[PDB]
Amino acid sequence: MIDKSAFVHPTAIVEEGASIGANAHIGPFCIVGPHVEIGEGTVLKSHVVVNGHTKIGRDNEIYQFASIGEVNQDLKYAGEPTRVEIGDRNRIRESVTIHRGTVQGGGLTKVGSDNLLMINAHIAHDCTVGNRCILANNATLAGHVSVDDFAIIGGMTAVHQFCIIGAHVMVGGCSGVAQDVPPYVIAQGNHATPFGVNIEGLKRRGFSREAITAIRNAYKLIYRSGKTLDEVKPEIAELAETYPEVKAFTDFFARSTRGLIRH
Amino acid sequence: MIDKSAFVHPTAIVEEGASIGANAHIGPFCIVGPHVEIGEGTVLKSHVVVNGHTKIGRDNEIYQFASIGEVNQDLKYAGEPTRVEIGDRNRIRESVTIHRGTVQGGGLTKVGSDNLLMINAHIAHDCTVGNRCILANNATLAGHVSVDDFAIIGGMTAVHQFCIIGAHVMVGGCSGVAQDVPPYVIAQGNHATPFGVNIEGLKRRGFSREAITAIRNAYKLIYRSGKTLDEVKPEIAELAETYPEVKAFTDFFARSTRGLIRH
Amino acid sequence: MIDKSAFVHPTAIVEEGASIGANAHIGPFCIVGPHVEIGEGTVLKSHVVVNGHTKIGRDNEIYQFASIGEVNQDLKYAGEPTRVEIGDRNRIRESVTIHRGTVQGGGLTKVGSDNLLMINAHIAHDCTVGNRCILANNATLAGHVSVDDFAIIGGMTAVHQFCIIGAHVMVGGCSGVAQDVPPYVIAQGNHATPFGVNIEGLKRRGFSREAITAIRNAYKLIYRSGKTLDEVKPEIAELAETYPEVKAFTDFFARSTRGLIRH
Numbered sequence A, B, C: 001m002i003d004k005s006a007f008v009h010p011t012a013i014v015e016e017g018a019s020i021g022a023n024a025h026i027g028p029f030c031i032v033g034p035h036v037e038i039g040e041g042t043v044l045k046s047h048v049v050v051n052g053h054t055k056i057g058r059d060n061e062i063y064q065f066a067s068i069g070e071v072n073q074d075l076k077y078a079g080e081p082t083r084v085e086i087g088d089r090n091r092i093r094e095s096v097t098i099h100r101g102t103v104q105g106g107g108l109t110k111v112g113s114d115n116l117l118m119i120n121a122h123i124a125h126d127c128t129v130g131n132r133c134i135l136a137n138n139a140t141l142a143g144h145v146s147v148d149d150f151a152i153i154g155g156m157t158a159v160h161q162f163c164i165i166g167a168h169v170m171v172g173g174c175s176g177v178a179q180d181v182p183p184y185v186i187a188q189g190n191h192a193t194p195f196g197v198n199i200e201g202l203k204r205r206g207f208s209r210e211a212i213t214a215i216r217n218a219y220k221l222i223y224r225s226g227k228t229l230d231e232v233k234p235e236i237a238e239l240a241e242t243y244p245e246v247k248a249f250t251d252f253f254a255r256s257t258r259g260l261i262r263h
C-alpha cells in the first residue's frame, strides 16, 4: 500500500504490493518490487532499483544508480526468497549495492541505522552492518562479513568473507582485510595488520579516560604480552569486571572464526 | 528484427535495426542501438545501455547500470566501427563496462560463455575473456588483456595492458598484475608474484592426480630450477609429450609478450 | 533557457531555469536541475544526473550513470548552495561522480578542460582538477585535493584529503597517495613514494632537453642531496632564474600543506 502522503514520480515503476510510507519520495526512473517496504520519509533520488523481500526504514536517503535487495553474487544462490533489512537515517550513495541473503548463510542481509555508505560501497549477501558505520568509496565486503557499530572502512578497501570488523575499528584505505579485527583497533595494510587503539574515535564518542586506558591494556594483552589468545581471554574477562567496555573483546572473541589480524 | 516472443518494456528504447531473439527480455529504461544483436532468452534487467556493433549470445543476464559495447577509453580511438562479441550464459552484474575494440588492436573485444563479471568489473577495448572466468567486484582490465578459460581475478585487482592471465589461474584480490601469468598459477600482490599451482581449482575441475603432478613439475622448472625460460621451454615441451595438460604452458609462452611474473 | 538548437530527449527531465546551449544534446532519462548550465555542443549520453549550482562548458562528453553537481559526502555539509565548475572538451565516463563544494572548503569544486575522467573516477567536494589530466578507472580523490595540469593518476589509486598532485606528475595504479607530490615526479606505492622525473611525459609535451635536465637537477636537490627542504628551496629558486620550468617547484611548495612524499 502506498501512503496518500508519499510522492511517486510518474516515471517510477512501483509494483503492486510494495509498501511506501508517509512522506516518502520515489524519484524519476526508480523501480520498486512488490515485496519492498519503504519507511516514512525515505527518499529514492532517481534511477534506484529496489527489489526482493526488502524492508527499508525511515528517513533514509538513497542516491541514483544504487541497487538494493538485488540477487547476490554467490554462485550457490539459486533464487530462494531471502531478505534485506535496512534501518533508519542511512545515507546510501550513488551506485551502492546491497544484496539479498542466501539460505546457506541465514537468509538475511542486514544494515542498521545512521550509516554512511559512500559511492560504490558493496554489502554482499548475509553481511551484517551495525549502526553509525562508514564505508568509504569502493569499500567492498565479501559475503557474511560483520561490520560492527561505529566501525569505519577506508576508500578502496576490501574485506574477505566471514571476517568481523569489530566495534569502533578504523580500517585504513587501500587495505585488504583477511582476518578478524578486534573492537577498538586501527588496522591498515595488505593484508591489514593492527596499529594500536583507535583512541581519537573513542575520545570523540564519549569514552572515559579510564575506559580508554583499560582498552589499551587489553590491546597490550592481545598483541604485546607474548601470550596466546587462550591465555589472555580470562585476563581480558578479569579486566572487564572493572571496566565494562572491555567486555566488547570477550563478545567479539566468541564470534570470531578467522583468527585475529596480527603483525 | 524483434522476435514476436521477445518482451520489450514500453520505456525501453530499441533502435530500428536491432535484433532481439526469441524470449529475450529488455527491461525498463534500457537503450539498445541499431547494430546490437541480443540472443534468445537474454535478459537486460533495467537501465542497461547496449550500443555499437555488438553481438550478445543466449541466456545472458545483464544487470542494471551496465554499459556494453560503449566507446572505449583509448585516446587513440577515433570512432571507427569496431566490435564486441559476448557468448552465452554470462552473468554480467551491476555497472559492468565492456567496451568496443580499436582498429589498432584488432577491432574486437570478446567475452566467451558461462562467465561471472561482478559489480563494476571492466573489460577494456581489445580484451579477450574466455569461458567460465570470474572477475570479482571492481576487477579492472586495461586494453588488450587476455583472461583465459577458468581464470579468476579477485576483488579490487587491476591488470596492466596486454598482459595474459593464463588458463585456470587464480589472481588474489587487492593485486596489481604487470606481467603475464602462466596457466595453472596462483598470483597475488602489488605487483603480483607467483605462489605455486592452483591445485584446488584443478582438483575441482577434474584434472587427474598425474596431470596435477606434471603441472607442479612444470611450475618447478619455471620458478625453482634456476634455469632461464629459454632452457626450460624444451623441457616443458618434453614433459607435455606424456601429460597433454602441460602443453598449455607451451601455448601460453607463444602468446606471452610481457615476460612472466616472478618472485 | 534552452537554446532552440539544443536537443532534449522527450524522456529527459530538464527543470525550468536550466540553461542549455546551442547544439547541446540531453539524452534519454537524464535529469538536469534548475541551476545547471550546459555549454554549447556538450552531450549527456543518457541516464546522467546533473544538479546543484553547476556550470559545464562546451563540447563535453558525459556518459551514462555519471552524477555531476551532487551533494558531497562530507558529514560537515548541511545543504548550503555550493558550486561545481567544469570547463571544455572533457570526456567524463560512465559512473563518474563530481560533487559540489562545502562552505568550509571554499564553496567550489572545479574541473578544467581537455581532461579524461575514466569509469567511476571520483572528484570530491572542493577538489581542483586542472587541464589535460587523466584519472583512470576508480581513481578516487578525497575532499580538497588538487590535481594540477597534465597530471595522470592510475587505475584503482586513491588520494588522501588536501594532497596536491603536482603538474605533469604520473601516479601509478594501485597506489595510495598520502602526501603532496611535487611537479614532474613519478609516484607509486602504498603509500606512494617518488621514483624520479616523468621524463617521457615532459619529452612528449615539448619540454626542452635543457629544461628536463634542470628539472632532474631540482629533483636531485629535493631527494638526493640530503639537505632539508628549507635549505633546497632557495637553491631551487636560484636554478629557476635560468630555467623557468623549475619555478613550478617554488609555486608548488607555497601551496603544499602535507609535506612531500618521500622514500
Ligand SMILES: CCCCCCCCCCC[C@@H](O)CC(=O)O[C@H]1[C@H](O)[C@@H](CO)O[C@H](OP(=O)(O)OP(=O)(O)OC[C@H]2O[C@@H](n3ccc(=O)[nH]c3=O)[C@H](O)[C@@H]2O)[C@@H]1NC(C)=O
Pocket: A072, A073, A074, A075, A076, A099, A122, A123, A124, A125, A140, A141, A142, A143, A144, A158, A159, A160, A161, A176, A177, A178, A191, B134, B136, B137, B152, B154, B155, B156, B169, B170, B173, B174, B198, B199, B200, B201, B202, B204
Ligand atoms: C585481501 C582480501 C581481498 C577481499 C576481496 C573480496 C571481494 C568481494 C566482492 C563481493 C563478492 C560477494 O558479493 C559475493 C561473495 O563473496 O560470494 C562468495 C561467498 O561469500 C562465499 C561464502 O559463502 O562462497 C563463494 O566464495 P568461495 O571462494 O568460498 O567459493 P568457491 O569455493 O565456489 O570458489 C569460487 C571459485 O574459485 C575457484 N577456486 C577456489 C579455490 C581455489 O583454491 N582455487 C580456485 O580456483 C573455484 O573453482 C570456483 O570457481 C562465493 N563466491 C562465488 C564466486 O560464488
Ligand SMILES: CCCCCCCCCCC[C@@H](O)CC(=O)O[C@H]1[C@H](O)[C@@H](CO)O[C@H](OP(=O)(O)OP(=O)(O)OC[C@H]2O[C@@H](n3ccc(=O)[nH]c3=O)[C@H](O)[C@@H]2O)[C@@H]1NC(C)=O
Pocket: B072, B073, B074, B075, B076, B099, B122, B123, B124, B125, B140, B141, B142, B143, B144, B158, B159, B160, B161, B176, B177, B178, B191, C134, C136, C137, C152, C154, C155, C156, C169, C170, C173, C174, C198, C199, C200, C201, C202, C204
Ligand atoms: C599495477 C597495474 C595497474 C593497472 C591499472 C590498469 C587500469 C586500467 C583501466 C581501464 C583502461 C582501459 O579502458 C583503456 C586503456 O587501457 O587504454 C590504453 C591502451 O590500452 C594502451 C594500449 O593501446 O594505450 C594507451 O595507454 P598508454 O599508457 O600506452 O598511452 P600513452 O602512451 O598515450 O600515454 C598515456 C598518457 O600518459 C602520459 N605518459 C606516458 C608515459 C610516461 O612515461 N609518462 C607519461 O606522463 C602521456 O603523456 C599520455 O598523456 C591507452 N590509454 C590512454 C589514456 O589512451
Ligand SMILES: CCCCCCCCCCC[C@@H](O)CC(=O)O[C@H]1[C@H](O)[C@@H](CO)O[C@H](OP(=O)(O)OP(=O)(O)OC[C@H]2O[C@@H](n3ccc(=O)[nH]c3=O)[C@H](O)[C@@H]2O)[C@@H]1NC(C)=O
Pocket: A134, A136, A137, A152, A154, A155, A156, A169, A170, A173, A174, A198, A199, A200, A201, A202, A204, C072, C073, C074, C075, C076, C099, C122, C123, C124, C125, C140, C141, C142, C143, C144, C158, C159, C160, C161, C176, C177, C178, C191
Ligand atoms: C592511502 C590513502 C587512502 C585515501 C582514501 C580516500 C578515499 C576518499 C573517498 C571520497 C571521499 C570524499 O567524497 C569525501 C571526503 O573526503 O570527506 C572528508 C573531508 O574531505 C574531510 C576534510 O574536510 O573531512 C572529513 O574527513 P575527516 O576524516 O577529516 O573527518 P572526521 O574528523 O569527521 O572523521 C570521520 C570519522 O572518522 C572517525 N575517526 C576519526 C579519527 C580517528 O582517529 N578515528 C576515528 O574513528 C570519526 O569518529 C568520524 O566518525 C570528510 N569525511 C567524512 C566522513 O565526513
Ligand SMILES: COc1ccccc1C[C@@H]1COCCN1C(=O)c1cc(-c2cc(C)ccn2)n[nH]1
Pocket: A134, A136, A137, A152, A153, A154, A155, A170, A171, A172, A173, A174, A188, C142, C160, C161, C178
Ligand atoms: C583515516 O580516515 C578514514 C579511515 C577510514 C574510513 C574513513 C576515513 C575518513 C577519510 C576521509 O573521509 C572520506 C573517507 N576517508 C578515507 O577513506 C581515508 C582513508 C585514509 C587513509 C590515510 C592513510 C594515511 C592511511 C590509510 N587510509 N585517508 N582517507
Ligand SMILES: COc1ccccc1C[C@@H]1COCCN1C(=O)c1cc(-c2cc(C)ccn2)n[nH]1
Pocket: A142, A160, A161, A178, B134, B136, B137, B152, B153, B154, B155, B170, B171, B172, B173, B174, B188
Ligand atoms: C581467493 O578467492 C578468490 C580469488 C580470486 C577470484 C575470486 C575469489 C572468490 C572470492 C569470494 O567470492 C567473491 C570473490 N572473492 C574474492 O575476490 C576474494 C579474493 C580474496 C583474497 C583473499 C586472500 C587471503 C588473499 C587475496 N585475495 N578473498 N576473496
Ligand SMILES: COc1ccccc1C[C@@H]1COCCN1C(=O)c1cc(-c2cc(C)ccn2)n[nH]1
Pocket: B142, B160, B161, B178, C134, C136, C137, C152, C153, C154, C155, C170, C171, C172, C173, C174, C188
Ligand atoms: C603507467 O601508465 C599510466 C599511469 C597513470 C595514469 C594513466 C596511465 C595509462 C595506463 C593505460 O591507459 C589506461 C590507464 N593506465 C593505468 O591506469 C595504468 C597504470 C599502470 C601501472 C603499471 C605499473 C607497472 C605500475 C603502476 N601502474 N598501468 N596502467
